[PDB]
């Protein structure tokens, strides 16, 4: 390991593994998997029905007390049956640690809103509904937060076009800003950058 390689920490790796096993033991009803990254990041995969309990536990337990919600986001993977992946990032100031909770959903199944647990989630959840179309149940006010009023479609889905469907201009006939089907003077050049000759043998998949 030369100065060009990021050094490994083993103490934190073991600590995170032990705490992940601890959380798994306490909550066997919801926890489906626990992983620790090679760079000491602990992530927990749970059933969607356990968002309110597990988070509450992590917020309220004496050993955990993850009091801060750093971020709440969603990841779109169209090849999965449950399209959307809801990610909760939590920070514990008492133990100076970070955790990640991961959940799955689809276009029609809603997710319970964690506003009752973390207030910070409120706006975050709105953003998810705006950008991926994931519905959050029992939300104080769920509406668009980023897109234009009356915007049709959820732009952060992997099948939404990059340039959208409509574009805005001004019309002097009607004396107002109008929306028309999008037409680009220069179409976006699509570059095929993926190369053959795979780079990382550590991530090779079986040839089924």
């Amino acid at each position: 390991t030369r100065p060009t390689i990021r050094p490994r920490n083993d103490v934190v790796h073991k600590q995170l593994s032990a705490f992940g096993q601890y959380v798994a033991e306490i909550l066997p009803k919801y926890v489906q998997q626990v992983q620790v990254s090679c760079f000491n990041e602990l992530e927990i995969f749970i059933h969607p029905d356990g968002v309110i309990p597990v988070l509450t536990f992590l917020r309220d337990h004496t050993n955990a007390q993850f009091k801060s919600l750093a971020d709440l986001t969603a990841v779109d993977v169209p090849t999965r049956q449950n399209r959307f992946e809801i990610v909760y990032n939590l920070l514990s100031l008492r133990f100076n640690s970070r955790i990640r909770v991961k959940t799955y959903t689809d276009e029609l199944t809603p997710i319970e809103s964690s506003v009752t647990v973390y207030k910070a989630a409120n706006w975050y959840e709105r953003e998810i509904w705006d950008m991926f179309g994931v519905f959050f149940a029992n939300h104080p006010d769920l509406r668009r937060i980023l897109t234009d009023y009356g915007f049709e479609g959820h732009p952060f889905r992997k099948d939404f076009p990059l340039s959208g469907y409509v574009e805005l201009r001004y019309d002097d006939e009607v004396k107002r800003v109008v929306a028309e089907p999008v037409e680009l003077a220069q179409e976006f050049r699509k570059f095929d950058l993926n190369s053959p000759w795979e780079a990382f043998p550590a991530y090779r998949q079986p040839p089924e």
Partner: protein
């Protein structure tokens, strides 16, 4: 607690796509062919969905 409905899934009304870009487009599902300029085969592992080619024209300014 469970609807137990029996119908094929269809989210067409919720995606915000214009009506003309749904019943007229034709997607192609395929494994991309290997580039014969190279012998590597790592780009022929996954499946791809792509739409049909539409009209492209030359801009009167800047071409």
């Amino acid at each position: 607690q469970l609807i137990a409905v029996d119908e094929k899934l269809d989210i067409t009304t919720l995606t915000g796509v214009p009506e003309e870009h749904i019943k007229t487009r034709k997607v192609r599902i395929f494994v991309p062919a290997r580039n014969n300029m190279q012998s590597g085969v790592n780009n022929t592992k996954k499946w791809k969905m792509e739409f049909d080619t539409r009209e492209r024209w030359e801009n009167p300014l800047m071409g």
